[PDB]
Amino acid sequence: MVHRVWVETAHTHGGEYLKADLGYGEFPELEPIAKDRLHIFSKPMQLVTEKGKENMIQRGTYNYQYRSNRPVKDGSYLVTAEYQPTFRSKNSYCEQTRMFGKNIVNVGHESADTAIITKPVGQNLEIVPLDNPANIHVGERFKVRVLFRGEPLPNATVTATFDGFDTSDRSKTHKTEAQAFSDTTDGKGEVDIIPLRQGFWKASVEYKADFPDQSLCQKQANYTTLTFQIGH
């Protein structure tokens, strides 16, 4: 089972704390970070607001649950998560894995701001939304841009699915990996996700390339996710 990183947020109105979940595993089934994987998530998830990036506090029954330090006003914020760089052997050579997740959260039933969500946060491989998904209806186009090391990434495959699309016969050894959208980015790194259903959506991109310092490691793999809501 391949483990991937994503972020989820419960519905939050103005004045209350922001509850968020770090998904490490098979979307959308949240699972506790196992003991041997704890070191991979040594840094807490971050909340991105007008004042910048602030750490969140890991509160809750399970170790994947987080809450904001302070109550949040109405707006459109980001919540980011990172699988910290790890090394592993393959064949023989070294490969460094890094993973990223980003969730767009709208606090308030009428919040469709774009000042914060459209600014890159500096993830090695990042999906930067170019619009607020709260403005996107079913069948319309939601424009995003893929950045790698701060630059647009052309011809990258961006796939997308939603919670409930693939549910049949799910178990610990079954696929449930089907995507409801697939396209490639253009020369500006942009692509238009076209959602055919309302729900909780996850878009995925990945990039395998050479590690910059060949004297320490050979290959690099990045897996980046963007989660958001379509519809109300």
- Choosing from 34, 38, 57, 196, the residue that interacts with its own copies (CB under 8 A) is 196
Closest separation in Å from C-beta 12 to Ni ion: 8
Mark residues 101-130: x for contact with its own copies by CB under 8 A, - for none.
------------------------------
70 vs 141, which CB is nearer to its own copies?
141
Pairing between β-strand 219-230 and β-strand 93-107 as defined by DSSP bridges: parallel
The DSSP symbol for 57 reads B
Nearest alpha carbon to residue 17 among 82, 66, 89: 66
Looking at the DSSP bridge assignments, the partners of residue 226 are 102, 203
Report the b/e string of 85-101 with b at 16+ CB within 10 A: eeeeeeeeeebbbbbbb
Looking at the DSSP bridge assignments, the partners of residue 7 are 22
Q: How many residues bind its own copies (CB under 8 A)?
A: 21
- Choosing from 69, 184, 198, 214, the residue that interacts with its own copies (CB under 8 A) is 184
Q: Taking CB under 8 A as the rule, does residue 176 contact its own copies?
A: yes
Residue with tokens 């959506």: 201
Mark residues 5-34: x for contact with Ni ion by CB under 5 A, - for none.
------x-----------------------
Q: Taking CB under 8 A as the rule, does residue 181 contact its own copies?
A: yes
Q: Taking CB under 8 A as the rule, does residue 165 contact its own copies?
A: yes
Q: Taking CB under 8 A as the rule, does residue 179 contact its own copies?
A: yes
Closest separation in Å from C-beta 195 to its own copies: 10
Residue with tokens 């980001």: 78
Q: Which two tokens stand for residue 170?
A: 């799910």
What are the residues whose beta carbons fall under 8 Å from the beta carbon of 174, sequence distance 6 or more?
Answer: none
Q: Taking CB under 8 A as the rule, does residue 163 contact its own copies?
A: no
Q: Taking CB under 8 A as the rule, does residue 180 contact its own copies?
A: yes
Closest separation in Å from C-beta 11 to its own copies: 25
| Measured distance CA(5)–CA(31) in Å, rounded | 11
Q: Which two tokens stand for residue 168?
A: 């049949």
- Site residues (CB under 5 A) for Ni ion? 11
